[PDB]
Nucleic acid binder design. Structure first.
Ligand SMILES: [Mg+2]
Ligand SMILES: [Mg+2]
Ligand SMILES: [Mg+2]
Ligand SMILES: [Mg+2]
Ligand SMILES: [Mg+2]
Ligand SMILES: [Mg+2]
Ligand SMILES: [Mg+2]
Ligand SMILES: [Mg+2]
Ligand SMILES: [Mg+2]
Ligand SMILES: [Mg+2]
Ligand SMILES: [Mg+2]
Ligand SMILES: [Mg+2]
Ligand SMILES: [Mg+2]
Ligand SMILES: [Mg+2]
Ligand SMILES: [Mg+2]
Ligand SMILES: [Mg+2]
Ligand SMILES: [Mg+2]
Ligand SMILES: [Mg+2]
Ligand SMILES: [Mg+2]
Ligand SMILES: [Mg+2]
Ligand SMILES: [Mg+2]
Ligand SMILES: [Mg+2]
Ligand SMILES: [Mg+2]
Ligand SMILES: [Mg+2]
Ligand SMILES: [Mg+2]
Ligand SMILES: [Mg+2]
Ligand SMILES: [Mg+2]
Ligand SMILES: [Mg+2]
Ligand SMILES: [Mg+2]
Ligand SMILES: [Mg+2]
Ligand SMILES: [Mg+2]
Ligand SMILES: [Mg+2]
Ligand SMILES: [Mg+2]
Ligand SMILES: [Mg+2]
Ligand SMILES: [Mg+2]
Ligand SMILES: [Mg+2]
Ligand SMILES: [Mg+2]
Ligand SMILES: [Mg+2]
Ligand SMILES: [Mg+2]
Ligand SMILES: [Mg+2]
Ligand SMILES: [Mg+2]
Ligand SMILES: [Mg+2]
Ligand SMILES: [Mg+2]
Ligand SMILES: [Mg+2]
Ligand SMILES: [Mg+2]
Ligand SMILES: [Mg+2]
Ligand SMILES: [Mg+2]
Ligand SMILES: [Mg+2]
Ligand SMILES: [Mg+2]
Ligand SMILES: [Mg+2]
Ligand SMILES: [Mg+2]
Ligand SMILES: [Mg+2]
Ligand SMILES: [Mg+2]
Ligand SMILES: [Mg+2]
Ligand SMILES: [Mg+2]
Ligand SMILES: [Mg+2]
Ligand SMILES: [Mg+2]
Ligand SMILES: [Mg+2]
Ligand SMILES: [Mg+2]
Ligand SMILES: [Mg+2]
Ligand SMILES: [Mg+2]
Ligand SMILES: [Mg+2]
Ligand SMILES: [Mg+2]
Ligand SMILES: [Mg+2]
Ligand SMILES: [Mg+2]
Ligand SMILES: [Mg+2]
Ligand SMILES: [Mg+2]
Ligand SMILES: [Mg+2]
Ligand SMILES: [Mg+2]
Ligand SMILES: [Mg+2]
Ligand SMILES: [Mg+2]
Ligand SMILES: [Mg+2]
Ligand SMILES: [Mg+2]
Ligand SMILES: [Mg+2]
Ligand SMILES: [Mg+2]
Ligand SMILES: [Mg+2]
Ligand SMILES: [Mg+2]
Ligand SMILES: [Mg+2]
Ligand SMILES: [Mg+2]
Ligand SMILES: [Mg+2]
Ligand SMILES: [Mg+2]
Ligand SMILES: [Mg+2]
Ligand SMILES: [Mg+2]
Ligand SMILES: [Mg+2]
Ligand SMILES: [Mg+2]
Ligand SMILES: [Mg+2]
Ligand SMILES: [Mg+2]
Ligand SMILES: [Mg+2]
Ligand SMILES: [Mg+2]
Ligand SMILES: [Mg+2]
Ligand SMILES: [Mg+2]
Ligand SMILES: [Mg+2]
Ligand SMILES: [Mg+2]
Ligand SMILES: [Mg+2]
Ligand SMILES: [Mg+2]
Ligand SMILES: [Mg+2]
Ligand SMILES: [Mg+2]
Ligand SMILES: [Mg+2]
Ligand SMILES: [Mg+2]
Ligand SMILES: [Mg+2]
Ligand SMILES: [Mg+2]
Ligand SMILES: [Mg+2]
Ligand SMILES: [Mg+2]
Ligand SMILES: [Mg+2]
Ligand SMILES: [Mg+2]
Ligand SMILES: [Mg+2]
Ligand SMILES: [Mg+2]
Ligand SMILES: [Mg+2]
Ligand SMILES: [Mg+2]
Ligand SMILES: [Mg+2]
Ligand SMILES: [Mg+2]
Ligand SMILES: [Mg+2]
Ligand SMILES: [Mg+2]
Ligand SMILES: [Mg+2]
Ligand SMILES: [Mg+2]
Ligand SMILES: [Mg+2]
Ligand SMILES: [Mg+2]
Ligand SMILES: [Mg+2]
Ligand SMILES: [Mg+2]
Ligand SMILES: [Mg+2]
Ligand SMILES: [Mg+2]
Ligand SMILES: [Mg+2]
Ligand SMILES: [Mg+2]
Ligand SMILES: [Mg+2]
Ligand SMILES: [Mg+2]
Ligand SMILES: [Zn+2]
Lengths: 58, 159, 105, 205
RNA sequence: CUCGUAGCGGUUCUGACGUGCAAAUCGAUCGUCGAAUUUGGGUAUAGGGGCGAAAGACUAAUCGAACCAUCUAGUAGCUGGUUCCUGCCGAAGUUUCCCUCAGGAUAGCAGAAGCUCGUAUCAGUUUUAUGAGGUAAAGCGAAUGAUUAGAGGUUCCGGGGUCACCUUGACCUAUUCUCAAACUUUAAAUAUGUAAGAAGUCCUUGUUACUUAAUUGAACGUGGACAUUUGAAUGAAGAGCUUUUAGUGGGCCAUUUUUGGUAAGCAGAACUGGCGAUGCGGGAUGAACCGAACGUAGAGUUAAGGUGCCGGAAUACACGCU
RNA sequence: CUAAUUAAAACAUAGCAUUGCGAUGGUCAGAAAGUGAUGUUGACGCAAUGUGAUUUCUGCCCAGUGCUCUGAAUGUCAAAGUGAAGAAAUUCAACCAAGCGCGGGUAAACGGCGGGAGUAACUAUGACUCUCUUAAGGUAGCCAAAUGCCUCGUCAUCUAA
RNA sequence: ACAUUGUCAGGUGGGGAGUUUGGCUGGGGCGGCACAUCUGUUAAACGAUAACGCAGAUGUCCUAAGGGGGGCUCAUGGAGAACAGAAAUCUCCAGUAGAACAAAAGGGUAAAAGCCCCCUUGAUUUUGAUUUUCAGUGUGAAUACAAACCAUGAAAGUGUGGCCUAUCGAUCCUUUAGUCCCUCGGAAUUUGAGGCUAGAGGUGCCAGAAAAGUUACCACAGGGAUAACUGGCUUGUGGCAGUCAAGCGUUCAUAGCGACAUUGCUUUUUGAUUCUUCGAUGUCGGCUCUUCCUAUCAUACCGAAGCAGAAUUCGGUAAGCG
RNA sequence: GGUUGCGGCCAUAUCUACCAGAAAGCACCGUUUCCCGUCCGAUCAACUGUAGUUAAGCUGGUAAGAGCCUGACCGAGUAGUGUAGUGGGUGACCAUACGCGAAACUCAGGUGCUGCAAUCU
């Protein structure tokens, strides 16, 4: 038998029961979709900086 | 039946804004975008490549990636009861800088400048913004300003 | 759909690894070949009493198949497969579009 | 074999016009919208009387005919058919549908009606000042063919124009007024003086 | 063959009876009554079988597949029922998929168990700055499409009317009346994105295989300067995170915006509040309206609604109208 | 005859007709059998059907479907068998019975049995004619019939209606 | 030495056996597809949003209609040229697109994305990321890069199909391509087979069973989630009233009427709906018998008449009585 | 300040009509062997700044010009609209309260500004 197709009634009250969450940002996001050539050079630019701060202090 | 294509309900959104059709002016292609800049999204209807979905019109996000002709943009989208990060691959004619991030950076520079003139002398310079305040005491003169006004007006039809 | 019977395309030949000339033909499937393991299992399952044991498809809806081009490299004799969209007609020979010319029939 | 007008009295729908999607709309039976001495000069008919709607409703084209004929015939009989000018100022552009038992119940076009507001003129008449009682009586006779409430307002404008009677006299005993066939043209302070001399000689004195 | 007893049936009363005398009888009226008659006993045919002058009839009150026992406590998305108290928290009728539509899975809502930390971490809110939108309105002497009336301009664009003439189709020009869910130059209100900093800002110089004509940039860095008015408001009820699982997946009503329909206590959407799941005071009465949400009491004040009497509270006071 | 709601117009019947079968057979049983029913039978018989006394008649159609036919024997064709190639499993090829295909017969087999136009010295009516498709185009008869929707058809009769 | 009998093989075989005979749905069936989709609108200016809502469209087509480059500008009009006129060609002027871009509709596009020419295969290879549908699964489609190899152009650049928004498909099985790679488990060689990676063959009910009917002889589980009859809401339709008065009524709107319009009432018609009842509210009509309503046919008393009488017609109080 | 080359914002720059432009530049203009391109050296290509010219282009100005742009306590706090009431009205709708707030219209003003390089009485 015919019934109720669709409604958005009560859905915002359900979403605000736990009160819509912001996704909790961090320092250093991931490199997901960051350009691969930049990533390849970033690897070596951080390798050399690890060695530079190693030799600076020892 | 029903229709939910990629550019459905975009009759007016991707229209090209009276007497501004045709070629895109060149400052659009010479603006420089760094990773971390806050950009606005408004799709040009005349360029069909790199084109954002209609959800992202009027949305404002952060550049995470820079490519040959395009930038990637982080946009927070409200899926159900939480926010999901969306990564967008948009060409730079669908992208413009946010003027809010201009205005806040001159406020940062003004804050540093007045803190320097407070360090020179006169500490506690009170450098936060304030909301609009209730007005102070005035004295209103009646000099060439004698308060003269009539009454409400009678009804006439003037048809 | 008219496709030329020769194509200058990439080769995964490992002594080509570059764009070479390819002879283009169509892919037809091949004989179903008894002693394939599914055919052996199917004959054993259909053996005896019990009737038909696997589903026999009836409710077909497509009137087209996808055209599969068989790209044979003229240099190293290695082959490749390309799929085209649904077409009701597929040619391989000539008769290019002579454009600026009055109609026939 | 026609639904009573209380079925289609109120503006309950979005305006459904005859378009490239409608395509099968029966003709409006009101086809004449100016009556009387329509060719008359603006100076001929200074007094304007308006029949004005007080309600937000729909007027059927049948009712528009039925009121136009009654007002026209009373004014023709009592005052002569070349002593007034009558204008129907609403046009039945909205298509009323009829569904002739609820599956697939979208309606086919029944007729044509005119969507009126509070304060729209339905009928405007211009006459001489001496014809006022006949025109008011003709419009009050035409009230009975329309549902809802309608007021008879005497306009403070000269004729069918959009400026006051002393303002129009100040404009025509000066030189900013020249005749058209049934309406009038006004002289502006803007435009080429060669064209504003080509028309309007009688100004610039 | 016939009328008609016995017999054998079973027409009609649609009689009686209809918790009967009776799980099919009683009475009257009827059909037939010497044979395809009626009947006893013996015998044969047994369940997907028999037997049938055929009604799916009959086969032990059982027949469109008897009866008995077992498999078997067959299966049921369907219906009923489901047993002590008190406390604390507390829903959903919505998303996606399904031979899915009386059912499931899945997400959400809900409880529990907590874990990591301890002041602002954040917020169904405002402000300021900055975006985005094409709905209401508006417009049509702006485009597209409709649409009313005239005027001006001479033509083998097949008007007859001289072979340049009152009575010309249009077309253009300037006006005029009126409109549009699938029209629009313009364009709100409400709703909506971002930002309002210590992961911040400046100064100097380290990395690299990316980038540049070029340490030019890019990204990440070292070292240094800036101390809570550290960068609007108000609040924060602690904040953040994890696992697990119940029920639900028929909804309905009101205000506003809406679609179809003449309409409906009709059918279907949008936002919020409610009922469901909820008593209390008021609307006589009532799921939803107004008011207000509830431990047990006491006192006081109220809301909504009232104050002739039923009925607690002024047959108050006042200006009129009927 | 539907025991216990239907006694009939239903079923049966005589009559009529069709079909199969001459016995190492027809039709039908049985798990099998050195087994059975018809059959202690033999075509005036057994078996399967349809129609349903008498009278009078039973029209046309073999396209469809069924049934049937010493009917055509390189169309299709399985297993075995044959040939080739292969190391062999195997693959390929030729042959390939019945059946189907082809052709014929058969309606007291199942069944089926049309539209329009132009036409008579009337106006419509249409002996006749023409194409449109058919396998044939509903014949003799009968009928608003227990079969006719429209329909309570039209006329007559029966009645005051 | 054929029958017979045994085994296997092909045919025939509703005689019999088993099973199936989608869904949505203003009840169901028929119809349609609102079942996978695309454009505009509905849709209430973020997004999302329903109905068997409205107007349409998809299961294709294209070796160019894909890619790159270059030159040019289109529709339409006007003014001119032998045939030649409204339409054939040629020339000039105007022309913001009023053209074209495969196919719906919307968006977009003018030294172009249109038209014409030149060169081509980037409609290629590898495997990730992202967007939209969304559960942030799949599939389809799209975006931006990276590693190659190319095309094109002088080049910057562009090109991972079609200017963008539709144009499509799991597991199992079969087949092909790829390395010449793994395995056949006592050790080998060679066939065969199995495997790994990538496509195809197809599920349109489009997240994908292998599927005809009928039941009036019927059965069960249920369902007032849902029809048939009362009631309830509504009142299109039916019925009954009113206003206005063109006109009829020998002159004369209104004695009686009354067009074109328009406002109502009723619930004795029929639709509309599906709220109540499916662990049953006895379903048509007649007979009998009571009461009630009034929108009065008769009877009582009146008013009006195109009421002379007679007979009528309109109207009032009135349901007492027939 | 003119002009050129390359621009930015893309009409305050466009459009219609008329009138001026010294100097330099730009331009029209002159020639066809060569590279190249056409049916046509018209366009494209090459060569000479020579034979000539400001006629056009181009620039600037004028116009109670069209358009465009800006502003206005001009319309107008109008239309619309968020919130509220056991407000009004049979209804259609409307008023009030606390807020936000258009468009057409009507007036007035304006009619390109500017970056890099080079050149010029
Ligand atoms: Mg159903
Ligand atoms: Mg539901
Ligand atoms: Mg809602
Ligand atoms: Mg909740
Ligand atoms: Mg939620
Ligand atoms: Mg769409
Ligand atoms: Mg669009
Ligand atoms: Mg826009
Ligand atoms: Mg593309
Ligand atoms: Mg296999
Ligand atoms: Mg086995
Ligand atoms: Mg296919
Ligand atoms: Mg009616
Ligand atoms: Mg409506
Ligand atoms: Mg009225
Ligand atoms: Mg006898
Ligand atoms: Mg007898
Ligand atoms: Mg008896
Ligand atoms: Mg009895
Ligand atoms: Mg008897
Ligand atoms: Mg008898
Ligand atoms: Mg007898
Ligand atoms: Mg006897
Ligand atoms: Mg006898
Ligand atoms: Mg015995
Ligand atoms: Mg027996
Ligand atoms: Mg059995
Ligand atoms: Mg029985
Ligand atoms: Mg039993
Ligand atoms: Mg059990
Ligand atoms: Mg029970
Ligand atoms: Mg609680
Ligand atoms: Mg259930
Ligand atoms: Mg239930
Ligand atoms: Mg869950
Ligand atoms: Mg919870
Ligand atoms: Mg709009
Ligand atoms: Mg819209
Ligand atoms: Mg609005
Ligand atoms: Mg509007
Ligand atoms: Mg217009
Ligand atoms: Mg709308
Ligand atoms: Mg608009
Ligand atoms: Mg804040
Ligand atoms: Mg739980
Ligand atoms: Mg349910
Ligand atoms: Mg409802
Ligand atoms: Mg419940
Ligand atoms: Mg409550
Ligand atoms: Mg109350
Ligand atoms: Mg109460
Ligand atoms: Mg009450
Ligand atoms: Mg309230
Ligand atoms: Mg309480
Ligand atoms: Mg008291
Ligand atoms: Mg019995
Ligand atoms: Mg009986
Ligand atoms: Mg009998
Ligand atoms: Mg009986
Ligand atoms: Mg019988
Ligand atoms: Mg015997
Ligand atoms: Mg008989
Ligand atoms: Mg007979
Ligand atoms: Mg035959
Ligand atoms: Mg063989
Ligand atoms: Mg034959
Ligand atoms: Mg014969
Ligand atoms: Mg016979
Ligand atoms: Mg027949
Ligand atoms: Mg006959
Ligand atoms: Mg007959
Ligand atoms: Mg009869
Ligand atoms: Mg009869
Ligand atoms: Mg033998
Ligand atoms: Mg045998
Ligand atoms: Mg079989
Ligand atoms: Mg069978
Ligand atoms: Mg069967
Ligand atoms: Mg239905
Ligand atoms: Mg159907
Ligand atoms: Mg649906
Ligand atoms: Mg889906
Ligand atoms: Mg909205
Ligand atoms: Mg939207
Ligand atoms: Mg609609
Ligand atoms: Mg729909
Ligand atoms: Mg489709
Ligand atoms: Mg080009
Ligand atoms: Mg095509
Ligand atoms: Mg998904
Ligand atoms: Mg998931
Ligand atoms: Mg798709
Ligand atoms: Mg693509
Ligand atoms: Mg590339
Ligand atoms: Mg593609
Ligand atoms: Mg592409
Ligand atoms: Mg294409
Ligand atoms: Mg193209
Ligand atoms: Mg499987
Ligand atoms: Mg395999
Ligand atoms: Mg091994
Ligand atoms: Mg080993
Ligand atoms: Mg072994
Ligand atoms: Mg080995
Ligand atoms: Mg092998
Ligand atoms: Mg193999
Ligand atoms: Mg691959
Ligand atoms: Mg496939
Ligand atoms: Mg599906
Ligand atoms: Mg699906
Ligand atoms: Mg039952
Ligand atoms: Mg119900
Ligand atoms: Mg109704
Ligand atoms: Mg009614
Ligand atoms: Mg009615
Ligand atoms: Mg009335
Ligand atoms: Mg009279
Ligand atoms: Mg019950
Ligand atoms: Mg009863
Ligand atoms: Mg009365
Ligand atoms: Mg009376
Ligand atoms: Mg009497
Ligand atoms: Mg009485
Ligand atoms: Mg009485
Ligand atoms: Mg030259
Ligand atoms: Zn190769």
């Amino acid at each position: 038998a015919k019934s109720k197709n669709h409604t958005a009634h009560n859905q915002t009250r359900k979403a605000h029961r736990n009160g819509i969450k912001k996704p909790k940002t961090y320092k250093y996001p991931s490199l997901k979709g960051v350009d691969p050539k930049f990533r390849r050079n970033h690897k070596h630019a951080l390798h050399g900086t690890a060695k530079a701060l190693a030799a600076a202090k020892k | 039946g029903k229709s939910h294509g990629y550019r459905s309900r975009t009759r007016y959104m991707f229209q090209r804004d009276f007497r501004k059709h045709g070629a895109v002016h060149l400052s659009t292609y010479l603006k420089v975008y760094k990773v971390g800049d806050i950009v606005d999204i408004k799709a040009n209807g005349s360029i069909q490549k790199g084109m954002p979905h209609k959800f992202y019109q009027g949305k404002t996000g952060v550049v995470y990636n820079v490519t040959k002709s395009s930038v990637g943009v982080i946009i927070n989208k409200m899926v159900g009861n939480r926010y999901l990060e969306k990564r967008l691959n948009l060409r730079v004619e669908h992208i413009k800088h946010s003027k809010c991030r201009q205005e806040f950076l001159e406020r940062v520079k003004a804050n540093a400048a007045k803190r320097a003139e407070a360090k020179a002398q006169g500490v506690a310079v009170q450098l936060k913004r304030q909301p609009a305040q209730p007005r102070e005491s005035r004295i209103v003169s009646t000099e060439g300003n004698v308060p003269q006004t009539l009454a409400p007006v009678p009804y006439e039809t003037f048809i | 759909v008219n496709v030329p019977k020769t194509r200058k395309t990439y080769c995964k030949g490992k002594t080509c690894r570059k764009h070479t000339q390819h002879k283009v033909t169509q892919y037809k499937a091949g004989k179903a070949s008894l002693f394939a393991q599914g055919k052996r299992r199917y004959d054993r399952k259909q053996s005896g009493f019990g009737g038909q044991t696997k589903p026999v498809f009836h409710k077909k809806a497509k009137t087209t198949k996808k055209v599969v081009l068989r790209l044979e490299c003229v240099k190293c004799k290695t082959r490749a497969q390309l799929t085209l969209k649904r077409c009701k007609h597929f040619e391989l020979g000539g008769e290019k579009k002579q454009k600026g010319q009055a109609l026939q029939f | 074999a026609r639904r009573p007008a209380r079925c289609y009295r109120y503006q309950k729908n979005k305006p459904y016009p005859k378009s490239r999607y409608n395509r099968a709309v029966p003709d409006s039976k009101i086809r004449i919208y100016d009556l009387g001495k329509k060719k008359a000069t603006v100076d001929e008919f200074p007094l304007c009387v308006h029949l004005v709607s007080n309600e937000l409703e729909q007027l059927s084209s049948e009712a528009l005919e039925a009121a136009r004929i009654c007002a026209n015939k009373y004014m023709t009989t009592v005052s002569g058919r070349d002593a007034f000018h009558l204008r129907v100022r609403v046009h039945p552009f909205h298509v009323l549908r009829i569904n002739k038992g609820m599956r697939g119940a979208w309606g086919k076009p029944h007729g044509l009606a005119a969507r009126v507001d509070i304060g729209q003129i339905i009928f405007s008449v211009r006459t001489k000042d001496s014809n006022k009682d006949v025109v008011v009586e003709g419009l009050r006779r035409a009230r009975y063919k329309f549902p809802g409430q309608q007021k008879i307002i005497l306009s403070k404008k000269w004729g069918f124009t959009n400026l006051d009677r002393p303002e129009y006299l100040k404009k025509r005993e000066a030189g900013e007024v020249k005749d058209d066939g049934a309406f009038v043209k006004f002289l502006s302070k803007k435009g080429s003086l060669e064209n504003n001399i080509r028309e309007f000689p009688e100004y610039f004195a």
